[PDB]
Amino acid sequence: AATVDLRIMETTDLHSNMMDFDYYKDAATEKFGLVRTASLIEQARAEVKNSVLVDNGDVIQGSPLGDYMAAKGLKEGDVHPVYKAMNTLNYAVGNLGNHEFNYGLDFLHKALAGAKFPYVNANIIDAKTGKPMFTPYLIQDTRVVDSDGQIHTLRIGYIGFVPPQIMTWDKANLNGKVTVNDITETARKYIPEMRAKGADVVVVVAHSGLSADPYQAMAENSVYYLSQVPGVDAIMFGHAHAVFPGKDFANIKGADIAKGTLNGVPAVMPGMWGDHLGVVDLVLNNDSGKWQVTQSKAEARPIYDAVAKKSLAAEDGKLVSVLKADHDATREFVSK
Ligand SMILES: [Mn+2]
Ligand SMILES: [Mn+2]
C-alpha cells in the first residue's frame, strides 16, 4: 500500500530563446529565456523527491539564435545550441512543435540527433511506409520513492502530438513526404497499447492549444478532447502562447482554474519563451494492485512578477557560460 508523489515539469514554446537577451534591443531582459526558467526548474526539483522534465517543442525556431543557426546550418554531428543548453537539464523527453519543420526535415533530423534525450511524436506518418516517422511514445522506467521511503520502478509513458496544420504551414517541406493524423484519434488508439505494454502513468505532451469548440477531426487545438480520452493522467501543452490554468480559460466547461484541472485531468500550459515553468503534481497509490492517481493539481510558475515588477528566477550562471560563444555569434549575426 504505497503512496507516491510525482512532479512533472514542462517547458514549451521556448522558440530558441536560450538567453535572457533581446537581440533587437541588444539588451538583457528578466521577462524570458531558458537561462532563467532553469532557476524555476532547480527550485521545483528541490521541493520534491520525485520529478521528471519534458519539453513541448517549438524550440529550434523563432528568435535570432534560431535565425542564426538556420543560416549557419548544421553538419553531421553538430550540436544545436538549444541542445547544448537542454542536454544539461536532464529532460525525460522532447516533443515536436509545428515550427520544428520550418527548415526542412533534414535540418530537423540533424538537430534532434544532437539532443541527449529521446524525442516522441505519434501523429506524423512516413508517406513511403505508413510507419510513424518518429517514435510515437516512450515508456520509461523511472526510479521513485514512496511516502515510507520504499523505492519502486514506475513505468511512465510519454506520447507527443503536433498540429495536423503543419501540412499547410510547411506544405513545401512536407507535402508528399509525410501526412499527419488527428491528435485525439491518435491518442485514443495508442493509450491502450501503452497500458497493455505496462505503462503505469500516461503523460500527454501536446503541442496544441485549448478550445471549447465541439470536436472535429484535424482540430489544431485539441486539448479539450484529449482531456476526455480514457487513461490520460496529465496534459502538458502549449502552441497557444497563453497561460493555463489562468483566467483566459475560466469559461470552459470542466476547467477548474484554481486546481489546474480540465475534466479532472491535470493540465498546464506555461506561456511562451520560457516565461513560465509548467508544474503538475500527482499523488499515486497502488493499493488496488495497479497505480492509480488519487490527487492532482497543476500550475504555471512565472519567472517574473508582473504586478510587483520583480524577478522570481535568477539567471543561471552555468548555462550562460555554456551559451557564451553562441550568444556572441548571435549578436554578430543580428548586426551584419
Ligand atoms: Mn509557438
Ligand atoms: Mn506552435
Resolution in angstroms, to 1 decimal, for this deposition? 2.4
- Domain 1-336's class? alpha beta
CA of 15 to the centre of ligand 1 (A): 7
Nearest 10 degrees: CA dihedral of 122, 296, 9, 169?
40
Task: Copy the grid coordinates of residue 25.
Answer: 534591443
C-alpha angle 298-219-239 in degrees, rounded to nearest 5: 45
* Contact present, 142 and 7 (Cβ < 8 Å): no
Half-sphere exposure of 332 (CA within 13 A, CB side): 10
Q: Which ligand number lies closest to the CA of residue 97?
A: 2
List Cβ neighbours of 236 (8 Å cut-off, separation of 6 or more).
8, 10, 12, 54, 56, 95, 203, 204, 205, 206, 267, 268, 278, 280
Solved by what technique? X-ray
Task: Tell how many helices (H) and how many strands (E) occur in the chain.
Answer: 9, 20
CA dist list (Å): 10 to 14, 53, 233, 328: 11, 6, 15, 28
**Residue 272 burial by CB count (10 A; 0-12/13-18/19+): exposed, middle or buried?**
buried
Is 13 marked as binding a ligand? yes
* Contact present, 206 and 191 (Cβ < 8 Å): no
CA of 239 to the centre of ligand 2 (A): 4
Q: What is the DSSP letter of 76?
A: T
Q: Which of 228, 241, 227 is nearest to 298 (CA)?
A: 227
Is 99 marked as binding a ligand? no
Is 241 marked as binding a ligand? yes
Q: Which residues, by Cβ under 5 Å, contact ligand 2, an ion?
A: 58, 97-98, 239
Is 58 marked as binding a ligand? yes
41/130 Cα distance (integer angstroms): 38
34/32 Cα distance (integer angstroms): 7
Q: Which ligand number lies closest to the CA of residue 98?
A: 2
| Sign of the Cα pseudo-torsion (250, 253, 256, 262, in order) | negative
Q: Which ligand number lies closest to the CA of residue 96?
A: 2
Sequence spans of domains, the chain = 1-336
